[PDB]
């Protein structure tokens, strides 16, 4: 399938060459998995997610995403328009409020909540977690997303918007996760990515499109938004077969685009996120 006219980030991860804006991807799109946003909540009204979308959990007094981050992640994961994943099952788990801070205990409580959930849900294709959130380094933290990866859930975690060392931030730190940092349409490492050889993996994260609350739309720019790209390709690549949730992030590894970033500071991969569906 292709999808022309694209958000240049879902562009980029089905090429090997920046500049193009066609998207390209096999059209089982992630049908069988299932992915969850772990976050402010989902819009799941909004059309682009066509019904396939569902808030599960709360730790607030209303699962709604009063912010829009949580709604803008989850569309770049499985939306219709914006989304990698465009056949995958969401599932919402509002872990931040609405002005997007959270307390580590209720993070870690969104977290072990996954690992027993997922079994209340039909993904046969494979489960994924999208955590495109953080704060300064924790064990617990990081212990509750070896947890979730351990239990089975290709994890997924935002590197972070310092322009640090991502080894002092959580849950990026954690090893066993799946590290995602960001880039630009030009293939620069992202001004605001952190990086240090905690990452795993680069994937499109300045002036990302994706939905918004009201049933809307706007481009914003973070980790937090390469994180949704990595986790919706990894549901894609679990629903072909490709990969399993324990092995997606080597997998995703082995088949990026290798050498291909500036501004990637001596001892952080240059890896790039590919689909390897046109080439
Ligand atoms: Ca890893």
Known sequence: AAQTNAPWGLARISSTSPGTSTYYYDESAGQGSCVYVIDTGI????????????????????????????????????????????????????????????????????????????????????????????????????????????????????????????????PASEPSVCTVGASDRYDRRSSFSNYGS????????????????????????GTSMATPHVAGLAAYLMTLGKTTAASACRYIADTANKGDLSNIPFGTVNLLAYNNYQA
């Open 198 to 221: 905690v990452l795993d993996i680069f994937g499109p994260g300045t002036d990302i499109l994706s939905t918004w609350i009201g049933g809307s739309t706007r481009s914003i720019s």
């Open 43 to 170: 819009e799941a009204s909004h059309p682009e997610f066509e019904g396939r979308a569902q808030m599960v959990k709360t730790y607030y007094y209303s699962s709604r995403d009063g912010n829009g981050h949580g709604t803008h992640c989850a569309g770049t994961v499985g939306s219709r328009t914006y989304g990698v994943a465009k056949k995958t099952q969401l599932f919402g788990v509002k872990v931040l409020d609405d002005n997007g801070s959270g307390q580590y205990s209720t993070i870690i409580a969104g977290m072990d909540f996954v690992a027993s959930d997922k079994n209340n849900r039909n993904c046969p294709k494979g489960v994924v977690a999208s955590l495109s959130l953080g704060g300064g380094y924790s064990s617990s933290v990081n212990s509750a997303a070896a947890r979730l990866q351990s239990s089975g859930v290709m994890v997924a975690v935002a590197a972070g918007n310092n322009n640090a060392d991502a080894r002092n931030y959580s």
